[model samples]
Target: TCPFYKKIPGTGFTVDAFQYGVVEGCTAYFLTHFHSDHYAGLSKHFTFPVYCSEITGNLLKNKLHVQEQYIHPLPLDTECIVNGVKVVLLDANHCPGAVMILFYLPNGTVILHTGDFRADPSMERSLLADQKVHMLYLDTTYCSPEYTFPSQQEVIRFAINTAFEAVTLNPHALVVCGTYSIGKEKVFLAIADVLGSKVGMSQEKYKTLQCLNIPEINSLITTDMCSSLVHLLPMMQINFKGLQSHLKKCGGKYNQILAFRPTGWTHSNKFTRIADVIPQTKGNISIYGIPYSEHSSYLEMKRFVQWLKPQKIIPTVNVGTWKSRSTMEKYFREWKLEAGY
Candidate 1:
């Protein structure tokens, strides 16, 4: 789903060759991770048994709540069998629960599927040991400088600057913005650090983060460590007067307090609604636009493929003409995603 170089099963019969890519008696399948892209087709595509890492399984069951049996779970760096194929799942390091897949065929061919991976040495180090990797299906989502993603640390620093310098806030205002509870909570923590007060949110928002397996940002901080920072339940609330009261209280307390949110690097339609709530105040409500992308950036995709050294790199599905290494030779192959990886 993320970026799997899946082998379309053979039809065996010449008459059935026209009916190829059909799923009839085929048996093997693999799943690289639990992100929206990797598992997007699982529930809707097929019931075929899929391979995954234990970390991914925990995420699927806990977050998406999919069935346990359909997922053939294994530990990282360990080899397991799927329909007689030796398979391995490695960390992609792009999300809380994500992985890259390695495959070994009886013919000695090797295949690597990088599911939206980043340049995390810890995750990529173990896979580098596969000296004979023949083909790699890489994550080219960030394969261009146009997709510059900010590192996590830079985001935190940006948030601090925005709250303290860019925008003014009412100390007692209940600030809210759209954000993913688990992954984006730390950015808020950074905002709290700058303001030295509790941000506010509802119980539902808090529960969502807790249930999503966000081990990094502790929501329990409100109960255990609220004094250290401002407490808030979510980016936005469902009620209007509650919103007004939130703003009024903050305005009454001080000229401004740091109240902010770390959302999509680019402003989407949802963010406009969030901005609407801030009211037309003289004090600025700073929004830090940090460049933190979940996928690899431009040349990183080519580097990932070059290191894999696959015999026939497939581009899976994408737009535009190919410009990466070794791509001109097979620009019009089985899939427009011709490979240099």
Candidate 2:
């Protein structure tokens, strides 16, 4: 359902990836993040010249095993010219190295491709109030009225607090953090810093984080899971089956396993806020799904639309799920919009 790859008209600059050399006449390829869904169809053997942030570029080479020569670093906040068009990178705030690409065309039309970001003050600071935007590539992951969640800061606090309380209640408990392969490093790191516990990571995730070079995170390879009070694994591991496998690695000295999942979809279509910490159980494993997300809700997306007021909106997710001609139009059809021209 990912319609990620696109090319701006009259500019050979490509956004994200669909397949290797899929977009004909594309001069420069831009990647928003290392998420597999965002970079779908990308491969280690891909040969085309590409551009992304230093972290994303490095991950492409070392983690995903792409060729080094083909990868180019696109630093944040700086403008560069590729294929006769000016390009600037804005922090996407979605994940490490995720960027919202702003393309300044020759005709003075500014096309903003929001790679996958929620509303942020940094984004507002990056753009002038008077700047006119012609087109926009939006991330409509939660473009529904019922999808409101809490702020990143608040969500982070809940995750840290939840982990704190859970760990404090069950002394010497083996806390397993449920996170994505790349995203959600912040939550785990915060928990580690607050609890003063070392996080155990698989060799691959440790290497990936090292490549990200986030100064706050201190992670080690998990040769032995029992050595650390908190161990990090993929989000799916919060289930009973997943916990059993992890329990097998450690001796039965640990009394309980608490898994924390930071996401907004846990309690959908209800009054949800950062303070609402929903709890679930998978056998003896207790799971906490905190209201945290990297994408904008319906109201946030509306605010962004009002702020930019682009001539067109192109949605990047759920493309195949909706039957409308434009997913963005269908998603925002109920809202009232007017032009005074």
Candidate 3:
């Protein structure tokens, strides 16, 4: 709970949590993104106002149906004053409307709250010009060395080509891609555009995509699975046992089923190299897991920390203040020696 909550130095503003009524004495609130973990108990029922990017703000109001008056939409890369604290928003590169907040506190400490960013050059450049960073609340999702993965574009390309190759091998195969409702549209839409095939989704998904208002997506919604060749559904939606039963009913109706799950967890030494997929299948359905991540690898994380050169590093995972000290103890000692501290 400590990691989930962060308080500003001078101002009593809070970030990403309102648990146990954090908004009671808070001057303002900020939500990093629309992820469930970040907005644990938030809803239309919560009366406190929260500031977030325009896109996330819309999702909260339209998708989650949070109350309208409690939502404050902020633009990216602009300096704004909240509770007498100067703050600026920068693109996080993790998901749409995700932003890293830089706060100039009344205590004169320059603090950076990396709201789930995935190493963007623009973000790095902006941080470089900030002169000094007294504190850094970092996103360390893949802090280990083994989680290294290919870029998102490269992985998406691999997915599209693999789907094309799979279909060519068996034309009657139905290609099902596992993706978050809106998080991985790059891989989903690219597969459709390159393969010259439109992907199908449930009526609920169709409505969500329609709200995005992309011209191509508006005309690309399909509810008929029989008429669909490819489908973009969430990983949780595809029940392996259920899919097997559905395929059994088809028999010769479709030659086979090909399911591609593109995610970061697919990173394993078993793949031999990057841009490779693990071939797994159940019955006649082929399941392929490709390593596609939107988070920074350990190498990128190290490089970012080197550039920012903050006096102290704060872990944003489920670690207490003392636990974080022990975690970064070795790295801090080494950096201190190098900096003549």
Candidate 4:
């Protein structure tokens, strides 16, 4: 089903709607981040004007090869005028260059489109302290009671300690952290720092990181395979067969492999601690599925909805069917009612 939530109800703006092709009545296109799911339909041939955070703008040009003339990079936490409407970009805390767009209509209505974000206490102060949000386009990827994973810090600490123990037991073991093109960087970065090991990645991935321009991250990455036992690989390569092939390519430089698959889908409410989750081990390769998500948990989403008190709630993800959409709206109504609205 086509996602009807991409377009704002009463405006010419569409946030992360490129995949639907050229949306009619779209005066401006806003990209929330550099993730592929968010920018699927965008290309160099696209003619419509695109607005995004400075980091996303850079990624568009460097990674996607989108032309520079059509992309307009806006500064974060600052107000700008786009087609007679006041717009503001606030950090979304999902990835580098991810922003939750705030649109103020001429009629005094405020709309917030959170492309994808992990809710934190700081957002209350930074994004919605004194403002009254009339509408909210939320990322409902984990908008259910079952997805109450631990905080990002806790997951990172667990991963670090797990890796530390693994490497200490087998000094020649190579640590592999699975990641996407842009997200889950914190998990691997923290693990690398705590282990006092450099991270190795392909030249292409290294170039992608260069676009972010983070000096400290640059210091932790190296192209030399043998220099660092900790390596960053695509999420698809964290499986048993994939790791065995990777180990073969190393040619005796590393003995065993310990892989961390950090994502929200791996978590379950049945498991209390991360250690309680089972690890997939085959021969010399072991894989741990860590619950480190960039998206907000069910509890976090509830708190955000209750605090913002938006008059209307729109679920951007999992809205393909009537049942899915209605299920999310029910939660929204329940939360709003509990908030005494």
Candidate with top TM-score is 4
Query: Cα lDDT for residue 76, model 2?
Result: 86
The order by descending TM-score is 4, 2, 3, 1
Per-residue lDDT of 1-341 in model 3, one digit per residue for the tens? 33333776577777887565654467688888867777777877878778998878878887788898999888777889876778888888776677888889887889898878788555567744757988889887766556677778777777778878877887888777776645666777777766667778777777666544366665555777666678766687565775676566545568677877766755374345655456776677777767766677766776677767888777776355576556555654565566553
Task: Estimate every model's Cα lDDT from 0 to 1.
Answer: 0.51, 0.74, 0.72, 0.86
Model 4, global lDDT: 0.86
The digit string of per-residue lDDT tens for model 2 on 166-239 reads: 77887757778877657767777777778877788777777788888676454433435556777888777777
Q: Runs in model 4 with CA error above 4 Å?
A: 1-3
lDDT of 1 by residue, 211-234 (tens): 445555463334432243354634
Pairs with steric clashes in candidate 2: none
Q: List candidate 1 segments past 4 Å from native.
A: 1-29, 41-48, 121-124, 161-177, 180-185, 189-208, 211-284, 320-341
Residue 262, candidate 3: how far off, in angstroms? 2.5
Predicted structure with the largest lDDT when compared to the true one? 4
Tens-digit lDDT track for model 4 on 59-103? 899888899999999998887998888888999989888999998
